[PDB]
Each structure stands twice: as C-alpha cells, then as structure tokens.
Ligand binder design. Structure first.
Ligand SMILES: Nc1ncnc2c1ncn2[C@@H]1O[C@H](C[C@H](N)CC[C@H](N)C(=O)O)[C@@H](O)[C@H]1O
Length: 265
C-alpha cells in the first residue's frame, strides 16, 4: 500500500508544482481542492506558498479530518495559507452558492483522483466540471488525475471475464462490451467508479472556455518528469519501467492519466 500512495503523492507533487510555477509567471494564489479527502495535499500547497485554499469533499468525516490536519500544521513562525472547508456533493451542488464569497476566483482547481465519480450521469459530470471551472480566472488551471479509459478496456478485453488485476488491485466491470458515455460502472479495490472517456471530458470542458494544456498517461508523465533532476531527487527522497516500483505497482499505477486544462481569455 505505502509505495504506491507515495508514487501518487510524488505525481501530484510534480503536477501541482509545475502549475504553480506557470501561475506565478503572471504577477495572491487562491486554490480550489475539489474532492480534497483527508487533506493529503495540504502540505503540497503549503510548500507551494499559496495564500488561500478552499477544500471541499462529499464526505463530512474526511473534510473534518482535512480541517484538523490543517489546524495541526497551523498550530505547529512559517507562512501558511488561510483555508475554507465545505462539505458538498460537487456533482449535484453548486459551489458558487456555498463559498463565503460567491464571486471568488481561483488560480488553480486541483481535482486529484475524483472525476470518475461524477460520470454517473451527464448532469453530474457537467456539474462537477462547472464547479471546477466557472470560477477559474483567465489563464487559471484545472488539473487532475483519473483512470485512463483506454487502459481499463484494453485490460477488460484481454481478460477471460469482467475482471482483472494482480495482488495489489482489482478491477470489476458491471457489464462488459457496453461502454456508455455516462454510467459505465466498474469496481476498483471500495467504491463504484464510472468510466471517463477523455475525448468527452475534453469536449465537455469547452463549455466553460477551457482548452487542453496536456493529457499524459502516468507512464508518460513519469518518464518525461524524471528528466528534471529536481523531480527525480524528490522521488528519491519520498520513496514498463524497470525500477522505482515493482512490476505489480507499475501495473496498478499505469491505469491512470494526468490532465491539465486552461481558462481562456
Ligand atoms: N461528488 C463528489 N463531490 C466531492 N467529492 C467526492 C465526490 N465523489 C467522491 N468524492 C471524493 O473524492 C475523493 C476520491 C479520491 N480517491 C480522494 C483523493 C484525494 N484528493 C487525494 O488525492 O488524496 C474521496 O475523498 C471522495 O470522498
């Protein structure tokens, strides 16, 4: 369990940091962490020296864990951002209606391992994308990590059943051979997720004046980003390709992709 979560932390680290550098090339960094969980990315924002962060999640128990983690860091002379915490279903509720400041603006929306939950339906996928995008400033960024639908199906079609995996993970599709845009249900060991067809996410984000910066598979992102010595030293410290992970860990990790979109002027 540890090694993978750690590789995923490194992934989000390198992803978050590139877009904070990109952000800062244009003269008070305000960030929306959408589906923030227990606050696994609070330190990344702290290290990035953002000034404001809104943390929101469907699970109140996790948001309260996020809030306590934050109070702990704050309680323990060094700079920390101010933070707003909201328990909401971002696929059914409108965050503009929840913020203290409805007309608040964000420089980044980070959406890490969350989007696949909103694709239960069109209304939900579109709502979570509005929430992510409508308040980004011109030039601001929508960044995330979600399973690559191409790799799920590849592995589905190779399989003798509706299931596949190794000792680390299991995928179990509800149905096989049928891939609707919305509602394409699978299990991933433990909640139900829904297939995210990336061409459809890309297209759908044009409604909120967003152009794709890049989509990379995890393996592609890994091998490009290891070439930066600073990203590589970070991996060194925090810890198919040969080393860094096992065969089985690359197998689990290689399911995912990384994306970045930009609000246009
Ligand atoms: N409709 C929704 N709105 C907001 N959060 C959701 C929704 N559906 C699932 N989630 C949350 O999204 C998160 C899924 C992620 N696996 C947690 C990842 C967390 N951002 C991290 O990178 O550590 C969980 O916290 C779920 O509670």
């Amino acid at each position: 369990i540890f090694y993978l979560r750690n590789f995923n932390n490194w992934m989000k680290s390198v992803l978050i940091g590139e877009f904070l550098e990109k952000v800062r090339q244009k003269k008070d960094i305000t960030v929306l962490d959408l589906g923030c969980g227990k606050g696994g990315d609070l330190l990344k924002w702290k290290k990035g020296r953002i000034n404001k962060l809104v943390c929101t999640d469907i699970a109140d128990v996790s948001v309260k864990q996020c809030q306590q983690r934050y109070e702990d860091m704050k309680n323990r002379s060094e700079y920390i951002f101010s933070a707003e915490f909201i328990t909401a279903d971002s696929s059914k509720e409108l965050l503009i209606d929840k913020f203290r400041d409805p007309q608040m603006c964000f420089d980044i929306c980070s959406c890490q391992f969350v989007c696949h939950y909103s694709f239960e339906s069109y209304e939900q996928a579109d709502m979570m994308l509005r929430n992510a995008c409508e308040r980004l400033s011109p030039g601001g960024y929508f960044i995330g990590t979600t399973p690559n639908s191409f790799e799920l199906i590849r592995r589905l079609e190779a399989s003798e059943t509706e299931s596949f995996g190794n000792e680390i993970y299991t995928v179990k599709f509800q149905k096989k051979g049928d891939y609707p845009l919305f509602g394409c249900k699978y299990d991933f060991n433990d909640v139900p997720e829904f297939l995210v067809y990336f061409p459809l996410l890309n297209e759908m984000a044009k409604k909120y004046n967003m152009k794709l910066v890049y989509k990379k598979t995890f393996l592609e992102f890994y091998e490009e980003k290891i070439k930066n010595n600073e990203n590589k030293m970070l991996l060194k410290r925090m810890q198919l390709p040969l080393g860094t992970l096992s065969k089985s860990e690359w197998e689990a990790t290689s399911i995912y992709l990384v994306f970045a979109f930009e609000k246009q002027q």
